[PDB]
Design an enzyme around this catalytic site. Structure first.
Site, mmCIF file in Angstrom:
data_model
loop_
_atom_site.group_PDB
_atom_site.id
_atom_site.type_symbol
_atom_site.label_atom_id
_atom_site.label_comp_id
_atom_site.label_asym_id
_atom_site.label_seq_id
_atom_site.Cartn_x
_atom_site.Cartn_y
_atom_site.Cartn_z
ATOM 1 C CB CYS A 62 -0.907 0.016 1.225
ATOM 2 S SG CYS A 62 -2.074 1.373 1.117
ATOM 3 C CB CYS B 75 -2.088 5.516 1.397
ATOM 4 S SG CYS B 75 -2.269 6.547 -0.098
ATOM 5 C CB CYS C 160 -2.176 -3.446 -3.299
ATOM 6 S SG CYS C 160 -3.662 -2.791 -4.097
ATOM 7 C CB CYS D 250 -4.449 -3.964 2.041
ATOM 8 S SG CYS D 250 -5.849 -2.776 1.953
ATOM 9 C CB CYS E 245 -9.593 1.147 -1.331
ATOM 10 S SG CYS E 245 -8.168 1.651 -2.316
HETATM 11 S S1 SF4 Z 1 -6.498 -1.901 -1.765
HETATM 12 FE FE1 SF4 Z 1 -6.281 0.382 -1.646
HETATM 13 S S2 SF4 Z 1 -5.764 0.805 0.541
HETATM 14 FE FE2 SF4 Z 1 -5.323 -1.402 0.133
HETATM 15 S S3 SF4 Z 1 -3.190 -1.442 -0.497
HETATM 16 FE FE3 SF4 Z 1 -4.438 -1.398 -2.389
HETATM 17 S S4 SF4 Z 1 -4.427 0.851 -2.777
HETATM 18 FE FE4 SF4 Z 1 -3.801 0.785 -0.562
#
Ligand code: SF4
Ligand SMILES: [Mg+2]
Lengths: 112, 110, 88
Positions: free
Chosen positions: A52, A54, A71, A73, A82
């Site tokens: 991820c 972020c 991801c 995740c 997300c």
């Molecule tokens: S699903 Fe969204 S929050 Fe999870 S790792 Fe991927 S981009 Fe980041």
């Protein structure tokens, strides 16, 4: 640094099929989509897995091995949460109508 | 630091700026290069710095070079905002939640 | 940490979900509301090969849900501490 073209394309194809499979949509601003896709690609290049973009991590290799934040995740897989705003549920105010995004869109929206 | 704008800091320049702030409140935007929501809130963070000209607004790229400071301040969610008074963190806001950041600034000023 | 130690001691414990929580990954069940469901803590994972990791739903909980026309369906869901209570 900039992610490799090949990893960006891996993560672009992933984003399209996973949005379709999960019933989610890309952000109305596809610059947000493109930035996150490049972060996934950059993490694949540097750490071996699309952690991820972020989240902040201490030991990257341990996070890759354990996999919670790889991801898609765990919060996305189980709760469709997300926080990167890559996969948005249709009720989200910033969800657009698209589940596709082209390489040209990724390059255009991240040129700056 | 020029106030009225957002100043990029790193692991070596951040704390001296905090020390020099005196009685001014410091706000810090901890971001990464590829976090989408970071880039969404960044222009709103700049507008806050142009409104709150009696506060010092900073931003820190939490990359490999700056990891010692990221670890010391504490960050798990990107973005994370810190508010500092008198040489220490007093408040944090996690996520790209503009109204939460605004409310925390207002609370810190009261 | 003591928190990690006391969490690991809850592995195997029966728990009840105490908050609204929808999950979407249960095979052939598009949406499951977990509030009030009872299961047991399968794992608590905050280490990997001895290194601390940053998973924010660290309790892996095993549930079985009866589905009409299918029988019991077993699944796992990741929870954090404020989403469940110990049953005893
Ligand atoms: S699903 Fe969204 S929050 Fe999870 S790792 Fe991927 S981009 Fe980041
Ligand atoms: Mg004072």
């Amino acid at each position: 640094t900039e992610p490799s073209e090949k990893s960006v394309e891996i993560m672009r194809k992933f984003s399209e099929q996973y949005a379709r499979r999960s019933g989610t949509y890309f952000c109305v601003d596809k610059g947000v989509t493109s930035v996150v896709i490049k972060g996934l690609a950059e993490h694949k290049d540097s750490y071996g897995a699309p952690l991820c973009p972020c989240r902040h991590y201490d030991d990257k290799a341990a996070e890759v091995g354990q996999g919670f934040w790889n991801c898609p995740c765990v919060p996305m897989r189980e709760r469709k949460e997300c926080h990167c705003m890559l996969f948005l549920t249709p009720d989200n105010d910033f969800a657009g109508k698209d589940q596709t995004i082209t390489s040209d869109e990724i390059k255009e929206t991240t040129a700056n | 630091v020029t106030v009225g704008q957002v100043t990029e800091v790193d692991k070596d320049t951040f704390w001296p700026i905090v020390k020099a702030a005196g009685d001014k409140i410091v706000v810090l935007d901890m971001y990464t290069q590829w976090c989408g929501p970071s880039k969404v809130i960044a222009p709103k963070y700049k507008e806050l710095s142009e409104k709150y000209q009696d506060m010092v607004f900073l931003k820190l790229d939490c990359n490999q070079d700056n990891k010692p400071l990221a670890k010391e301040l504490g960050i798990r969610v990107v973005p994370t905002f810190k508010i500092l008074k008198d040489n220490k963190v007093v408040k944090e806001v996690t996520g790209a939640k503009y109204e939460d950041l605004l409310a925390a600034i207002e609370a810190a000023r009261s | 940490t003591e928190e990690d130690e006391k969490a690991k001691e809850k592995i195997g414990a029966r728990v009840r979900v105490t908050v609204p929580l929808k999950v979407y990954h249960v095979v052939r069940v598009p949406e499951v509301e977990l509030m009030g469901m009872e299961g047991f803590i399968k794992d608590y994972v905050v280490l990997w090969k001895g290194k601390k990791i940053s998973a924010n739903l660290p309790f892996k909980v095993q549930f079985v849900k009866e589905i009409e026309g299918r029988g019991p369906v077993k699944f796992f869901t990741h929870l954090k501490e404020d989403e469940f209570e110990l049953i005893d």
